[PDB]
Amino acid sequence: DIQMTQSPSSLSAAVGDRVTITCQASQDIVNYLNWYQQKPGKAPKLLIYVASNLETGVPSRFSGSGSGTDFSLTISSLQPEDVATYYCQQYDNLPLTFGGGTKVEIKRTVAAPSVFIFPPSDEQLKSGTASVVCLLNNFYPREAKVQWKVDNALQSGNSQESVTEQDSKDSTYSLSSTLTLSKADYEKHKVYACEVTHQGLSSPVTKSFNRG
Amino acid sequence: DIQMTQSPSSLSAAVGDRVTITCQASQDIVNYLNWYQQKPGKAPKLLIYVASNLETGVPSRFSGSGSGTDFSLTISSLQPEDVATYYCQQYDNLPLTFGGGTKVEIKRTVAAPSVFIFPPSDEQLKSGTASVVCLLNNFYPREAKVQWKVDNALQSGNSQESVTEQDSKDSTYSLSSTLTLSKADYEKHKVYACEVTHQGLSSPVTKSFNR
Amino acid sequence: KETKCNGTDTKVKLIKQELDKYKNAVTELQLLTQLGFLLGVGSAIASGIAVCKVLHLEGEVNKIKNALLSTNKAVVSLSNGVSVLTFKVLDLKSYINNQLLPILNQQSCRISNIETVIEFQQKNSRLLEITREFSVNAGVTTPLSTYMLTNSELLSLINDMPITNDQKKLMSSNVQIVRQQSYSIMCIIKEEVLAYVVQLPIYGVIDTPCWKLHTSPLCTTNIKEGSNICLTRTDRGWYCDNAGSVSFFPQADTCKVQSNRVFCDTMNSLTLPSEVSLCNTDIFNSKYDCKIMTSKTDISSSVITSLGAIVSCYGKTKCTASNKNRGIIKTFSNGCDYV
Amino acid sequence: KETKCNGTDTKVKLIKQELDKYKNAVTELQLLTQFLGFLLGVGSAIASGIAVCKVLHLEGEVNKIKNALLSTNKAVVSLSNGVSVLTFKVLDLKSYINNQLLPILNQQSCRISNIETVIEFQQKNSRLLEITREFSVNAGVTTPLSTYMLT
Amino acid sequence: QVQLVQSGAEVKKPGSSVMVSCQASGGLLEDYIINWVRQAPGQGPEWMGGIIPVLGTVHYGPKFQGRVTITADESTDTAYMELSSLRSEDTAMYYCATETALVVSETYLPHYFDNWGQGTLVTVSSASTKGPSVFPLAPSSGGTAALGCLVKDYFPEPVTVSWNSGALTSGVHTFPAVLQSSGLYSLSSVVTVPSSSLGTQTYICNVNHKPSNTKVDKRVEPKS
Amino acid sequence: QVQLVQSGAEVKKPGSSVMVSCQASGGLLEDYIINWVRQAPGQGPEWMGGIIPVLGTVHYGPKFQGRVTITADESTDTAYMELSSLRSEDTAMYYCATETALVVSETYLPHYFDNWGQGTLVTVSSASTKGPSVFPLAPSSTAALGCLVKDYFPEPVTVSWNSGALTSGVHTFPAVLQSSGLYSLSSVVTVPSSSLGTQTYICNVNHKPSNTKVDKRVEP
């Protein structure tokens, strides 16, 4: 099979930047190479076919070049909605094969997260379990930390966090952390808080709540 | 030599208008004619080569036409960043020769100048010279008048003014006037003023200071 | 199978029509793929026809295809009896299959980018030109055109022939004559491959002495108007030394002259003993019977030689040789003379 | 002199092969330059043409031809021997290549934005190639006189 | 303008066989090259095979030949992909992708994928199908409040969620599912909204877990 | 995509000879047609000559033949221009401009200029080079501030705000020639009046011909 080597594996560029992506084949494939865009969770969309032909409806900022074994994809003015993973694909011979993929991320000015906490619902407590949710909304960069605090005792390793992909319109992230415990232990304490540190806040922001 | 005739020498057009410039050759040069753009103080930039081919990165509003002895450069929608002097150039034979040039200016709405006065610095007075600066900032049209007033006496011919070229993003002008006097004569009077008249002010605006 | 694109718009009509011209030329080829009098007759393309005939055997073409898959030059073992150099020049398959039709199919025959169609018509051009020539010459063309075999291809093919470097150098320095003594035989288009046999000359006898004999009728010049006798040497033509004998070409235009080299074809020649040269020096020699014709046809004529002119002047005819800057310089008397 | 187009695209490949076909024709032609009836006298059909060819080969003779047809397309030239011959410049591909095509090519490293340029070049280049092809198949001597030889 | 509709996501037992369908609307199957591409989590796509009904040719990737069958039902314009002897490595999103085959010569091959299905997530596992429970995340007391609903304890992925029948999209963040230590997936969906509309506006999250035949419309608002 | 770097501006004595250099980055001198163009103040451009390194041929405009020398040092990718016998007419901005020369035939001629140098202002005069003094223009009761650059020769002097960080609102006026012979020029910028205390504004004045770089701090 023909192996496609896509480089780099990841890149960070500002809005309006000129970005170049390269694809190399394990043998000569003339110009029989395609390009696709995949946003997280969506089907791929065809951008470039035969190395250099623009697909109808694709913004003019995308272009492809190359021949033989090395090809390139260039975005002349990187835009927020371009955050996605891109794949090259050859069809010189079978089987059709793809590159490893290149994930393109936008670098933007640092934004503070909005921190909100949700207690477990009265509806959920009837089922016998309590989940307390803490939210970081529209922040950058990727790295943040949330340590739960029940009353004043920090809870360690009894929670699970999930992070969205970079948002396609403003290049920020969001993060939800869920602290799962039994019904007996939830009614054991009174005041619940989640403490959040990030580069966008001068001091760490804490949100807590009283049962009622 | 081949003489290139560019016409007109200057024109004033509104934003969004379609503007045409003409270049005439003294003999047939087929289509061996180029066009250049020169903004004030900057190098010329190639816009059109071989009469009609658009240079890469040049806005789509530019086009070139012609053959034989008469050629044209066309901007379909004149934009503020287009304020510059344009030149045609032939290359049928050596020496390469240029047109006389066409200065294109943008006609917009009348804008009043912001009037600011600056006294001479304390550091400069020790060296033996004093400059008093008066400023008209981001105004239109080109024509303005500044008559100095020291105490209450109108000053004549003791100042020098310099005006910027038309601004590339908003098509306004700026003008700086410098009043040069000796340190002995500067400290001879007390209150200095510069009074400014223009079509954008109902009454002339005066800004003054006490020494 | 068929271009199932609908033919109306201006963009579609040119590429679709261009495709039809290719498919019709291909279809056309399948239809098509089914002195001197003493000389001896030959079969000019008996060699080429023999090779073509081998390709028609079942499954024989497959050996050719498999060998030219990795390189553009291969020596193939045919099932019958001959090893032949085979050459894939144009690859229309991978262009149509992997570069053009995908571009075409994706946008429903709206080729938005005119550049692709122009490249196709040039890539398609040589086939139509080769097809066109074969379509006018009953599958056998001569001379070998530049669409049949480019100079780049010909010089490279020249280098691979089983001859000395002296023979190779001659052919490469006079490629124009080579073309005129070559044939192209169209014969098979089946199993996604088109192939034709190119038949090049092989010059095995080089640098031997060669001479040209010019003759003109010789009559007596007597006063009686109708009583005259004429005599003419009939052994005119080219004579080259060859293998201890002389290769004789009676027909004048069967040879092409470049400087000092005479390119001739042995097929239209007779092989004569070396004593033929004596007819020039001693027409009555007792060792070779010099060929002559007799007549009473007392007609004046002239023969232009390589370095002059023979003039047979008889009767009341005015015969004159002139210079461009001086006019007439010599007036010929009756008889055969030379200047 | 040389085709140094490093960037590969369908347009670049089109002009380069079109340029190569012209560059090939010049070299290709340059290679070429180095009852009754039996009583009828034999002639040399092109002895006249051969004689004229031989004079043009003389040292410094082509310059005489070139300089006379430099300003006009019709001139009578006196050769070194004594003969005046009508001379005709039919195609001026030189002034086309130098001042309209070669500048266009160099600007964007062989990426022609207007496909019209390649079409014009191939049309401007067509007459030269067709003349070459007739000579290339007929040993430098054609008859009858084609319309590509002389309109 | 032609939409490719694949069969729904499902969980199949290891060693069994799965059949995925792909429905074409707006054109005939003969007029396309129909390809099947799969994507495992954290990998690129992998081409499985393609069928060209106009030529009557089926092609299989070497890794999948002998355990994959792709057919083209021209009577319904539905393409299918059957993969037998399912195991853990096969847990992936399977995509049905087409290439237009209007003007084709023989030995025509698939080259690209310009029209795609929505994808079918096939999860191979021993666990049973289970629908999720949805619980409100009520807001309370600057000028923007947040609320949401929690979709907990379902198997397998995916679960879908829309706000106000898809009306509320600017500001929604539906987080990727997390596999809890207990097993089964759980997921959260939050949206920020101006604090002045907390009483005047209705916010409903429409959660669908198609594998389990679960349709839930959960209203969110403060309590008292 | 190739940058042409000319030598710095200077004042040369009348009658002497001056040489202007032009450095190409990203390509070889052979890969271009190298032209030299000059423009006197208030005049259009005038073609002086050009060099074609691939053919080793130079062509001169008639007015400049015999007192202009253009060379191309391909060992360093540096082009040069030597003008001898300086007089009043030569005060001008000199430009280095290229025409790309990939496919070059014989008898190739210069045709156009697609890539330009920044220009070199040669001032022919006996007046000694002199650096300027800069004086603050403090803002007080949108506000405006600036600095005054006085008494320099010859032109030009450049100015940047906050090392190029502050660009929106800058107005640098053309120089005016004073009676002393020296030049003077001003640079003013408008900025919200609320940043007069929270923002620092520094103008970076450079006169390379005299090798005088002076940064005078200004604040209300």
GROMACS .gro file of N, CA and C in nm, chain C residues 89 126 130 144-151 153-154 157 179 196 198 200:
model
   54
  512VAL      N    1   0.488   0.516  -2.593
  512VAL     CA    2   0.522   0.657  -2.609
  512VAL      C    3   0.422   0.745  -2.534
  549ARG      N    4  -0.162   1.367  -3.093
  549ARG     CA    5  -0.075   1.276  -3.167
  549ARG      C    6  -0.151   1.153  -3.215
  553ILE      N    7  -0.159   1.045  -3.601
  553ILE     CA    8  -0.120   0.910  -3.644
  553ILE      C    9  -0.239   0.840  -3.707
  567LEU      N   10   0.842   0.786  -4.295
  567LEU     CA   11   0.801   0.781  -4.155
  567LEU      C   12   0.789   0.924  -4.103
  568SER      N   13   0.667   0.964  -4.070
  568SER     CA   14   0.641   1.101  -4.030
  568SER      C   15   0.695   1.129  -3.890
  569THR      N   16   0.696   1.257  -3.853
  569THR     CA   17   0.737   1.296  -3.719
  569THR      C   18   0.630   1.267  -3.614
  570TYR      N   19   0.505   1.250  -3.655
  570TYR     CA   20   0.403   1.203  -3.562
  570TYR      C   21   0.419   1.054  -3.535
  571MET      N   22   0.463   0.978  -3.635
  571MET     CA   23   0.491   0.836  -3.616
  571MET      C   24   0.606   0.815  -3.519
  572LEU      N   25   0.715   0.889  -3.538
  572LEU     CA   26   0.837   0.870  -3.460
  572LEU      C   27   0.911   1.002  -3.455
  573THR      N   28   0.914   1.065  -3.338
  573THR     CA   29   0.987   1.190  -3.322
  573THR      C   30   1.138   1.166  -3.335
  574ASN      N   31   1.211   1.275  -3.359
  574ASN     CA   32   1.357   1.264  -3.368
  574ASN      C   33   1.416   1.211  -3.238
  576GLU      N   34   1.278   1.001  -3.034
  576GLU     CA   35   1.254   0.858  -3.038
  576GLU      C   36   1.342   0.791  -3.143
  577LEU      N   37   1.359   0.855  -3.259
  577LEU     CA   38   1.433   0.791  -3.368
  577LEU      C   39   1.581   0.777  -3.334
  580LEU      N   40   1.619   0.506  -3.087
  580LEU     CA   41   1.602   0.377  -3.154
  580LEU      C   42   1.722   0.346  -3.244
  602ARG      N   43   1.414   0.839  -4.254
  602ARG     CA   44   1.269   0.848  -4.255
  602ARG      C   45   1.212   0.807  -4.390
  619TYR      N   46   0.178  -0.035  -3.339
  619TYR     CA   47   0.214  -0.041  -3.481
  619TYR      C   48   0.361  -0.075  -3.494
  621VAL      N   49   0.717  -0.023  -3.672
  621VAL     CA   50   0.802   0.070  -3.745
  621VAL      C   51   0.918  -0.008  -3.805
  623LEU      N   52   1.269   0.024  -3.989
  623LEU     CA   53   1.381   0.112  -4.020
  623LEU      C   54   1.483   0.042  -4.109
   0.00000   0.00000   0.00000
